[PDB]
Amino acid sequence: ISDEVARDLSLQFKRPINPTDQSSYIVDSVTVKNGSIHLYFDKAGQKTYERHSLSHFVNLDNLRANNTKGSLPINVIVFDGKSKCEESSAKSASVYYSQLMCQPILLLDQALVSDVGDSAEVAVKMFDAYVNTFSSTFNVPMEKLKTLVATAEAELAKNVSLDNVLSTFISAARQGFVDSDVETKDVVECLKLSHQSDIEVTGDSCNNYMLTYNKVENMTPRDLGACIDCSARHINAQVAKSHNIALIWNVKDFMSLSEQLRKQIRSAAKKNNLPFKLTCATTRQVVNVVTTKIALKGG
């Protein structure tokens, strides 16, 4: 019996009754071990947890409140936390299923469940994504790539580390399409950073240009010295848009920059809606531009 039904039953029986437990609770953390998923929540000021199989969590749509199946295999409901609309209706809708299952229902935010989806072949998926990015960068014929992927399949069966396997893959593939000055480690690190930060990568020459919104007054001395080393320049956004100029920086130099600076630069670029890519090239393109050289007020 829950409060939402206890009042109705008391009204029907014309005498007070005492509900036994709350209708639902909210999960706060998730732990996954041995093909099973653990959910944690607080009840009456005390930590509580439960264990369930991860197999049923593959299909998120099956656990939605609007499921037409009419039954819940598990007492867990997935909902979007940022969606204030449906999260309010989920609380009310949980009552029917709680009465059907005769136990409280667990509320779980959708984003955490999306993060939950995990396997051992996710590394293989990441490797495939890296191979696709490399192919898009170089447009190598498909059959050689397929043979190399077939070899990489045996390598994955050996369960070797991603770094060494990818290094060997690129070293074999780089022949006949990549200049000798480029190193495999640079490509591997650039691919990893591109995947983790959702950044597109091109092999064209860099320009080391930045907008005025990246004010130097907030700069730390270390990042300012790095900018001096890279010899960056400032330019107006609309002028760059007129000439169709994107933000091109060297992958190594960009990585040498601080995390906060990179995040701020990317946020400014996305606000101004400017294409931005990283490169392994060590040369600067020469285009007709008007730019101001970034420097300290030395004196």
Partner: protein, 49 residues
């Protein structure tokens, strides 16, 4: 010799060529400042172009 090549004319790209053969025999139709180099073998002054 080591020479520079580009498409957008501001990017960073570099090619290494041998002086035994002409530009055209190795790559193909190539020109420099209005002068045809397809059927011309390079010399020392062509470095860095």
């Amino acid at each position: 010799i080591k020479v520079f090549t580009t498409v957008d004319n501001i990017n960073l790209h570099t090619q290494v060529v041998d002086m035994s053969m002409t530009y055209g025999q190795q790559f193909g139709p190539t020109y420099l400042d209005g002068a045809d180099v397809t059927k011309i073998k390079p010399h020392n002054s062509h470095e860095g172009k």
